[PDB]
């Protein structure tokens, strides 16, 4: 009764909308009135990934052209693209938009008839009347200039700080490997033997001055050696004497690769400490005023000289610890100012980069190798005396590289942020070069603009991601990539319902159809040099029963919306205020779930729900009652919310530095839902009983068939065993905890070590699988399987022995345990949010 109609419309959702991996929703149905959504106490919204990677077994996005007519059929009023959910009247002569309801005309080249059900006869013949994700071929009216090639220009810091940490030699090796990998976007992979890598490559290094690398060939056909043109004018940037500062990579294969090899040796003996990265990123702008592209910036420290230098007042830079006189650690109200940019200078330059269709990537790697600038500043005046020595070697933390100030260079142009604390070549080289090869050779679009529409009676309140906001709805992206995720929050329009007898949520005059639709349109140029329109259409039916709309929730998307809202609330008033909001929003959501659930005999079971893999949650709803599904859903929400309380995003101040929290917040506002839930809920695997978890055939370990990873361990310390090895990943780093009583036969198989003392955290990441024993090769199989299961193959592995100082980073990630941030288990945390509810 009154549930068969719900499951028919829910079936229409699952077979016509845009797929799950492109768009993901918090709730599958929507409330009808503003009074219902205030009692819901859970956020409503979508996550949009317009260039998402397509899993095998799933259809690719089809391409639809409109012939020589060159008219993409569009609504006149709201300009919403054609989608399978329009309504066709007068034998298809007119079509009503499912977002704004206007009855548009059908073009003369679009004249086809209708079937008995009111739909069109060629509905499956044309791809965009049956699938929610379509890629149109945009005509000439959408281009303002001819399609610019894929373009890259690398900024490498070559100061004495950077060459000591090996950033100059790690970045150059990564750039060379990514350009020669054969997956460079802009290279014609449709195989006809002809010299046309249209990709554009420039090289700029920087120190107290800014250096430009001439790379073009000579006019006489000879192989010209590369040049280094110093430019010391760090107040008014210009371009030196060349027109070959920005050359095509195919025509200059040898010159670019040779110059990358010369850069680490040439600046090897550089003794200059200060840097002018602000002038250097302006210098990259003057090169690409006529094409555009991407800066792959590698910066170790904020600019101390040159243009765009930010000084923070109040002495707040010493909060991480550089002074010992009683003046900056007793004011927690001012610590929120450390998390926002201190000047208006970088938002205005990010606007200038946007108008030139230029994006900036950041690879911020402050050094830990005893920088001499921390004590060699000229002194005058008064003291002396007494008593040294003996112990305690350093515990070198990351110096304050002011990541909050330099964020809008990537956050406002669609670029990405990659941070490396305490950069050394032994630990972060492989993670840096895998990030370089992935950011360069992934699916990339250029000069993108996106626009997100909602149906009438709905509006968008909060927009998150890495973009520029032009107008009120026009997303601007200098570049768009496969990892760009943009989240929206939706609510009801109380102003649009007081203007006549049309107050029912977009009802067409054909007799009532309660469907709310969101349209994601992306105008961008792909890597092959043609303009595409990426159209995603997603719908949710209007429902009046709170039993339907609560039971149709996605507990992972609901959590990710609460995390992104908590970042804004912490940026507005206080981190502790956002911590209160996360615990509060857990309690009203759970009291809603207990009120809709008719079973009152399950509130005392403080267990863990059945944890599936990330993306297999809407499958365990076929043999379970609806009451049992919703208790496990809200319990899973409380687990993930409790995860981000214990994570680096909301830990107390004394245990996580300022710029670590900056990068955690920048990740959580732009990551997809599968990586956010990996951050708030780490996955744990056992490695010491790999021979036990295997079949009688031992099905050969190849990836052709999946490398077998059954057991996902719970995140509490009581299943930890002292003779065990345990791998934990949290979407950012891997920690491989090894017990004191681990088997020496296992140790010799994996790292080749004879004892636990024969292992240090630095080199044993690369030592896995080196001894070629079958046990340790399977450990490397596990490490590479979790590495490649995500989008990017860059995720460092820091091996931890029991008894080293680095053990606490493992034990803090045990979310069911009690950590120095929150002294609560999951059993106690459910109890606290049940009495508060």
């Amino acid at each position: 009764s009154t549930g068969s109609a719900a499951q028919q419309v829910l079936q229409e959702i699952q077979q016509f909308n845009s797929p799950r991996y492109f768009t993901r929703a918090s709730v599958a149905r929507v409330p009808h009135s503003s009074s219902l959504q205030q009692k819901l106490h859970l956020p409503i919204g979508l996550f949009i990934r317009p260039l998402a990677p397509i899993r095998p077994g799933s259809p690719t996005v089809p391409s639809v052209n409109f012939g020589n007519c060159g008219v993409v059929v569009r609504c006149k009023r709201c300009r919403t693209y054609i989608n399978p959910f329009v309504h066709w009247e007068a034998h298809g002569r007119r079509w009503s938009c499912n977002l704004c309801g206007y009855v548009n005309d059908t073009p003369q080249f679009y004249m086809r008839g209708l079937d008995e059900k009111g739909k069109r006869e060629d509905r499956f013949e044309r791809a965009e009347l049956s699938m929610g994700s379509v890629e149109f071929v945009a005509p000439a009216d959408y281009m303002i200039r001819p399609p610019q090639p894929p373009a890259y220009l690398f900024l490498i810091d070559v100061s004495a700080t950077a060459v000591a940490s090996g950033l100059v030699e790690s970045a150059c090796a990564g750039i060379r490997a990514a350009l020669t990998s054969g997956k460079l976007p802009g290279c014609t992979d449709s195989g006809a033997g002809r010299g046309d890598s249209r990709t554009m490559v420039g090289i700029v290094t920087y120190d107290s001055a800014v250096h430009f690398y001439a790379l073009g060939s000579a006019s006489g056909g000879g192989k010209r050696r590369p040049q280094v043109l110093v430019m010391p004018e760090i107040d008014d940037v210009f371009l030196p004497l060349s027109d070959d500062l920005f050359v095509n990579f195919a025509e200059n294969r040898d010159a670019v690769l040779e110059a990358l090899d010369t850069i680490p040796s040439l600046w090897r003996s550089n003794g200059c400490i200060d840097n002018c990265m602000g002038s250097a990123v302006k210098a990259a702008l003057l090169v690409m005023k006529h094409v555009g592209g991407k800066i792959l910036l590698f910066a170790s420290f904020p600019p101390t000289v040159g243009a765009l230098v930010t000084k923070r007042s109040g002495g707040l830079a010493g909060a991480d610890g550089a002074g010992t006189d009683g003046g900056s650690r007793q004011q927690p109200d001012r610590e929120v100012e450390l998390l926002k940019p201190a000047s208006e200078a970088y938002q205005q330059f990010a606007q200038q980069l946007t108008q030139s269709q230029v994006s900036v990537d950041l690879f911020i790697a402050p050094s830990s190798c005893a920088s001499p600038a921390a004590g060699n500043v000229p002194p005058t005046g008064t003291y002396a005396g007494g008593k040294p020595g003996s112990g305690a070697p350093g515990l070198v933390t990351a110096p304050y590289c002011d990541l909050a100030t330099i964020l809008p260079l990537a956050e406002l142009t669609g670029g990405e942020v990659r941070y490396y604390s305490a950069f050394s070549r032994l630990q972060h080289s492989q993670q840096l070069e895998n990030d370089i090869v992935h950011i360069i050779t992934r699916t990339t679009g250029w000069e993108a603009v996106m626009r997100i529409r909602v149906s009438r009676g709905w509006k968008i309140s909060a927009r998150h991601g890495r973009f520029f906001l032009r107008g009120t709805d026009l997303f601007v992206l200098p570049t768009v990539n496969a990892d760009s995720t943009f989240s929206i929050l939706m609510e009801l329009d109380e102003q649009a319902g007081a203007g006549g007898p049309g107050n029912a949520l977009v009802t067409p005059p054909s007799g009532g159809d309660n469907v709310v639709a969101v349209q994601a349109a992306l105008l961008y140029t792909n890597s092959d040099g043609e303009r595409r329109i990426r159209v995603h259409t997603f719908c949710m039916p209007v429902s009046q029963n709170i039993q339907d709309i609560v039971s149709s929730m996605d507990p992972e998307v609901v959590t990710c919306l609460l995390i992104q809202q908590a970042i804004d609330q912490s940026l507005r008033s206080k981190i502790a205020d956002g911590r209160a909001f996360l615990q509060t929003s857990c309690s009203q959501l759970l009291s809603v779930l207990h009120s809709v659930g008719s079973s009152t005999q399950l509130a005392a079971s403080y267990a863990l729900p059945s944890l599936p893999h990330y993306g297999a949650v809407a499958a365990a709803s076929a043999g379970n009652p609806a009451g049992g599904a919703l208790l496990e859903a809200g319990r899973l929400v409380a687990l993930f919310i409790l995860g981000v309380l214990k994570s680096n995003a909301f830990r107390p101040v004394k245990e996580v530095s300022t710029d670590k929290r900056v990068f955690s917040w920048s990740r959580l506002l732009a990551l997809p839902v599968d990586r956010i839930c990996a951050y708030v809920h780490p996955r744990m695997l056992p490695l010491h009983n790999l021979s036990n978890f295997g079949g009688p055939s031992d099905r050969v370990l190849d990836g052709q068939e999946e490398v077998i990873l059954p057991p996902a361990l719970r995140l509490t310390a009581e299943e930890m065993t002292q003779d065990g090895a345990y791998l934990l990943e949290n979407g950012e780093e891997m920690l491989l905890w090894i017990g004191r009583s681990i088997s020496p036969q296992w140790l010799a198989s994996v790292f080749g070590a004879h004892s636990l003392d024969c292992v240090h955290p630095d080199v044993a990441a690369a030592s896995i699988g080196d001894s070629q024993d079958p046990v340790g090769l399977r450990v490397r199989a596990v490490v590479q399987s979790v590495q490649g299961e995500h989008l990017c193959n860059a995720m460092r592995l820091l091996v931890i022995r029991q008894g080293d100082p680095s053990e606490q980073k493992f034990f803090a990630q045990l979310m069911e345990d009690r950590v120095p941030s929150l002294l609560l288990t999951f059993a106690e945390f459910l109890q606290k949010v049940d009495m508060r509810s």
Partner: protein
């Protein structure tokens, strides 16, 4: 370059539309690649300013006076900041050679109805400012090989 005595000092600047102060000094580790500081040919830079871009300006607290026991074979007539441009002829003979056959014409486009862009005035300015900071009251001759009229920046005629 071979007619001068082997002990004499030498520097080199090639100027087109912009002035290039070349790198002759440095260690034996970066001999294969040439460097050139670039000065914007159409703007006014004082002698004080030019020494500040090149680091040749005299530091106000630059007394660590003769207190290095173990500095290896450092030439004491020239400061290390100024040794990167001015070197003995017999010591930078290969690098001063290799700059010369590399020297081609001005690569910037010259319109067919315009003279080429030429900062002869700034070229003598950055020649004289370097010799101020490094070579004060010491025997210097600035051999200016010019091939036509100056057209840009200071000292420009037509």
């Amino acid at each position: 370059l071979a007619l001068m005595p082997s002990d004499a000092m030498v520097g080199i600047i090639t100027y087109g539309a912009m002035a290039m102060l070349h790198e002759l000094g440095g260690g034996s580790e970066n001999v294969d690649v040439m460097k050139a500081h670039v000065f914007r040919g159409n703007k006014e830079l004082t002698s004080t300013q030019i020494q500040q871009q090149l680091g040749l300006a005299r530091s106000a607290n630059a007394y660590v006076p003769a207190g290095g026991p173990g500095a290896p074979a450092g030439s004491p007539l020239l400061r290390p900041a100024a040794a990167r441009f001015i070197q003995p002829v017999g010591e930078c003979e290969y690098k001063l050679t290799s700059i010369l056959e590399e020297l081609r014409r001005d690569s910037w486009p010259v319109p067919s109805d315009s003279r080429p862009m030429r900062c002869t005035g700034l070229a003598l300015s950055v020649a004289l400012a370097v010799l101020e900071a490094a070579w004060y009251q010491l025997p210097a001759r600035v051999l200016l090989f010019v091939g036509g009229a100056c057209t840009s920046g200071p000292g420009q005629v037509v």
